[PDB]
């Protein structure tokens, strides 16, 4: 089997991407944030505290003839941005772009933090990291990809995120029309539960490539590109007037600037992030200070190849017995 679903930016900055997912019988379609940095499929639901729902579409398990309460199971998750959610668990039929998994754990939110309530466009998350990170207790549950893997034509999924435009998540096949050149594959460590890999270096604009190992995670659920402070300083030094602002929470730059590109290495290959992809717009409405798309990871503990980086590539998440990642230009 295969599946193919369009993913759409939630706003004009590409702050996140939503993909429609069918849950239950008859289908209830919710728009989920596919997150290769986490491993829970959780949804706003009929059980979510009413004051914490503000425009999201909810899953109502009582209206699904295939929903079954997973007795005794609970979940609770906290994300790198400080947001969180928790609740109980059903199993139900879940389909993505024509690919169906029966008995998928659907984690029903009883509580969500304010950032989730405040984002009416995201109805939940669909985690695509390794199932060892799944938070369901006392019996850990498998991701949608893990459940579908054996049925897929090939044990892979691909992320093709658009810049200010829709893109595609495919399951079970590699669309050879979706990228240019060849796909360069690189080793993955699953030791932290992430799609963790080592970039071979970087360049700023037309500058020379610096060969240096940068360990980080391919994370579709993180908006920006978080890299070591040395690398980020070297990038922003090429932008007149850019500075790190403690009050804003990162590098800002004059909105009148033209940003340089940023290149990252994948083995001997190179992925170029155009400068425009690094502009996240005014820090507040009407400001002429703009927020940068490349930020320091120094306060995180890990480097994160988020959407800013991934949207410049066609990315293969290869879930073979030894997983690998592939990157192509497009």
UniProtKB/Swiss-Prot annotation:
Keywords attached to this entry: Aspartyl protease, Disulfide bond, Hydrolase, Protease, Signal, Zymogen
One of the GO BP terms on file: proteolysis
Class of enzymatic activity (EC top level): hydrolase
EC number: 3.4.23.22
Positions of transmembrane segments: none
An annotated Gene Ontology molecular function: aspartic-type endopeptidase activity
Disulfide bridges in this chain: 255-290
Peptidase A1 domain: residues covered: 17-328
Active-site positions on this chain: 35, 199
Catalysed transformations (reactions): Hydrolysis of proteins with specificity similar to that of pepsin A, prefers hydrophobic residues at P1 and P1', but does not cleave 14-Ala-|-Leu-15 in the B chain of insulin or Z-Glu-Tyr. Clots milk
Family designation: Belongs to the peptidase A1 family.
Name by which UniProt lists this protein: Endothiapepsin
Record gene name: EAPA
Location of this fragment in the whole protein: 90 to 419 of 419
């Amino acid at each position: 089997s295969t599946g193919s679903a369009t993913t759409t930016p939630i706003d004009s900055l590409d702050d996140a991407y939503i993909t429609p997912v069918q849950i239950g019988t008859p289908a209830q379609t919710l728009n989920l944030d596919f997150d290769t940095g986490s491993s829970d499929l959780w949804v706003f639901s009929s059980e979510t505290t009413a004051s914490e729902v503000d425009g999201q579409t909810i899953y109502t398990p009582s209206k699904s003839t295939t929903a079954k309460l997973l007795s005794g199971a609970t979940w609770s998750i906290s994300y790198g941005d400080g947001s969180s959610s928790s609740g109980d668990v059903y199993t139900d039929t879940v389909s993505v772009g024509g690919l169906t998994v029966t008995g998928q754990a659907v984690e029903s939110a009883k509580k969500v933090s304010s950032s989730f309530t405040e984002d009416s466009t995201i109805d939940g998350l669909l985690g695509l990291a390794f199932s060892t990170l799944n938070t369901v207790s006392p019996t850990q549950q498998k991701t949608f990809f893990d459940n579908a893997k054996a049925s897929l034509d090939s044990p892979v999924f691909t992320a093709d995120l658009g810049y200010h435009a829709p893109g595609t998540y495919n399951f079970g096949f590699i669309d050879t029309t979706a990228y240019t050149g060849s796909i360069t594959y690189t080793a993955v460590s699953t030791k932290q539960g992430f799609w963790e890999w080592t970039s071979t270096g970087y360049a700023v604009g037309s500058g020379t490539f610096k060969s240096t190992s940068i360990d980080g995670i391919a994370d579709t659920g993180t908006t920006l590109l978080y890299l070591p402070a040395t690398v980020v300083s070297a990038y922003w030094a090429q932008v007149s007037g850019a500075k790190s602002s403690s009050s804003v929470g990162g590098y800002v730059f004059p909105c009148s600037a033209t940003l340089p590109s940023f290149t990252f290495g994948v083995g001997s290959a190179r992925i170029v992030i155009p400068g425009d992809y690094i502009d996240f717009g005014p820090i507040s409405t009407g400001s002429s200070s703009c927020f940068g798309g490349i930020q320091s990871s120094a306060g995180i503990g890990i480097n994160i190849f988020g959407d800013v980086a991934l949207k410049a590539a066609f990315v293969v998440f290869n879930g073979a017995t030894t997983p690998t990642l592939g990157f192509a230009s497009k």
